[PDB]
Amino acid sequence: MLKKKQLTVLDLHPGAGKTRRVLPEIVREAIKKRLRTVILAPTRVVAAEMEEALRGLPVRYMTTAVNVTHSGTEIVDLMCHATFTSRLLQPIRVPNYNLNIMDEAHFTDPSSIAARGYISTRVEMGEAAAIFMTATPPGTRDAFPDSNSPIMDTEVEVPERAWSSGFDWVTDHSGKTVWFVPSVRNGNEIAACLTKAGKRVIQLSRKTFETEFQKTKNQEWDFVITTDISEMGANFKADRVIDSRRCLKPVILDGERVILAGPMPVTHASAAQRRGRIGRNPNKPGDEYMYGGGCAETDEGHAHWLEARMLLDNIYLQDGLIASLYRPEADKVAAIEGEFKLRTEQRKTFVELMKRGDLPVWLAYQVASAGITYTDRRWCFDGTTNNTIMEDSVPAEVWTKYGEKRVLKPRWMDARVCSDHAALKSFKEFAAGKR
Ligand SMILES: COC(=O)[C@@]1(C)CCCN1S(C)(=O)=O
Numbered sequence: 492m493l494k495k496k497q498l499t500v501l502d503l504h505p506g507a508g509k510t511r512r513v514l515p516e517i518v519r520e521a522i523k524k525r526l527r528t529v530i531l532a533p534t535r536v537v538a539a540e541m542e543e544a545l546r547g548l549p550v551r552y553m554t555t556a557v558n559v560t561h562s563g564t565e566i567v568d569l570m571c572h573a574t575f576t577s578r579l580l581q582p583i584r585v586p587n588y589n590l591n592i593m594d595e596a597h598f599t600d601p602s603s604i605a606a607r608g609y610i611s612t613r614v615e616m617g618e619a620a621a622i623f624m625t626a627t628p629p630g631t632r633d634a635f636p637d638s639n640s641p642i643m644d645t646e647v648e649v650p651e652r653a654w655s656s657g658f659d660w661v662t663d664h665s666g667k668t669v670w671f672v673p674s675v676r677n678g679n680e681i682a683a684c685l686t687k688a689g690k691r692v693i694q695l696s697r698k699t700f701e702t703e704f705q706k707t708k709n710q711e712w713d714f715v716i717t718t719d720i721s722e723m724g725a726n727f728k729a730d731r732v733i734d735s736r737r738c739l740k741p742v743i744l745d746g747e748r749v750i751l752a753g754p755m756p757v758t759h760a761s762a763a764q765r766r767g768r769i770g771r772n773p774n775k776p777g778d779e780y781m782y783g784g785g786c787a788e789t790d791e792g793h794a795h796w797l798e799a800r801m802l803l804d805n806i807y808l809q810d811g812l813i814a815s816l817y818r819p820e821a822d823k824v825a826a827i828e829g830e831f832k833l834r835t836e837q838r839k840t841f842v843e844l845m846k847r848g849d850l851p852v853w854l855a856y857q858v859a860s861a862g863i864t865y866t867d868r869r870w871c872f873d874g875t876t877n878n879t880i881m882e883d884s885v886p887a888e889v890w891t892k893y894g895e896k897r898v899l900k901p902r903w904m905d906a907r908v909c910s911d912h913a914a915l916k917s918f919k920e921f922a923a924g925k926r
Contacts, residue, residue, distance in 0.1 A: 498614045498621040504637040505626045505767030511544045526589040530569040533595040533723040576602040596623035604799035612814040627760035629819035634762035638770035649783025653684035666730035669715045673737040673754035675911040678716040722764035736784030741794040749905040756787035796824035798852035804831040854905040870902040871922035878904045892924030
């Protein structure tokens with residue numbers, strides 16, 4: 492696999508040992524051939540799992556999730572997918588890695604899609620080798636792949652709100668369950684219901700993942716309520732998965748705003764990854780997978796793929812050339828390569844709005860291309876009356892950096908800035924000039 496001009500899709504079933512057995516072997520061979528190597532982890536929890544698998548091998552961990560003293564003589568770097576894309580965007584020089592290994596290469600966040608497009612373009616140009624590690628590569632139509640032990644699959648009605656009766660099977664269980672919900676707000680309602688019934692519940696989401704995941708090992712639990720984030724390597728010691736088979740989809744309407752459409756069916760890849768959390772111990776057959784809906788290819792027209800093109804149009808590759816999206820996922824967006832390319836100063840603003848401002852890619856692009864500087868927050872208050880952000884059924888309010896009390900009415904409306912209590916609290920601080 493290690494020869495140039497070759498991208499290998501390592502697609503063993505979930506739990507086959509791609510991380511703990513296959514990855515150290517690849518790394519030993521790459522170190523033997525003096526290949527400059529990058530290992531890309533989806534999250535910080537996977538990066539820590541990787542240090543345990545690669546202990547004793549000379550790897551430079553470019554993450555603060557690991558506390559290692561680096562010798563300064565390593566030719567293998569390990570960083571998160573987002574870190575790689577971030578450094579490609581920033582003026583920091585990134586080595587031209589001879590071998591690029593992406594673990595959990597099915598991740599659909601904009602920074603992951605952009606990293607795949609960049610790496611696969613370098614391979615197509617004959618400059619590098621690449622290994623994409625995932626049981627569910629782009630385009631997969633099998634939601635029921637192989638497992639370490641047999642799984643009991645059951646199509647059943649799954650509650651999406653609190654309930655009083657009709658779902659005795661949910662609470663009559665004596666093992667541990669991992670339940671996938673379409674959103675944080677939906678997970679809160681179901682968690683409150685289970686807690687009221689005497690259950691011990693832990694809730695996972697993107698912003699709280701590293702902190703709350705530790706609780707699955709530190710304390711006894713009955714249920715874990717999670718969003719799609721637990722599809723990226725998150726290992727659990729569970730005997731059941733309750734899968735709503737639903738997710739929210741960001742959609743750009745009329746090129747003017749972003750809405751959170753749905754809940755709608757997950758892809759075949761997501762359903763297979765959610766099921767993949769159980770049936771992993773060959774000595775414990777009969778883990779349960781209860782699913783409450785079907786799959787559809789909801790990745791078509793999803794805004795993440797448009798955002799990855801916004802990222803790639805602003806990364807240098809060679810003169811005026813721009814990296815293309817990885818061919819199996821290149822048709823999910825109707826976008827012309829280069830249409831989002833910004834000049835030096837607007838690009839610098841675009842980067843800072845995502846990196847420091849913590850804004851979604853699409854929203855940061857609208858601000859930067861309009862000629863607005865990073866610290867100028869006047870667009871947070873001068874939008875139309877139907878762009879008013881609502882908190883507790885009343886217009887949200889902030890004190891501006893001038894000391895004036897104003898209604899949050901952004902010129903560009905992106906539903907992700909107020910999708911939950913935490914996101915809106917962060918957007919209020921941004922609009923106030925607090926970061
Ligand atoms: C945490 O998010 C990031 O780091 C990414 C890679 C996400 C999209 C671009 N930004 S950016 C400006 O490069 O920081």
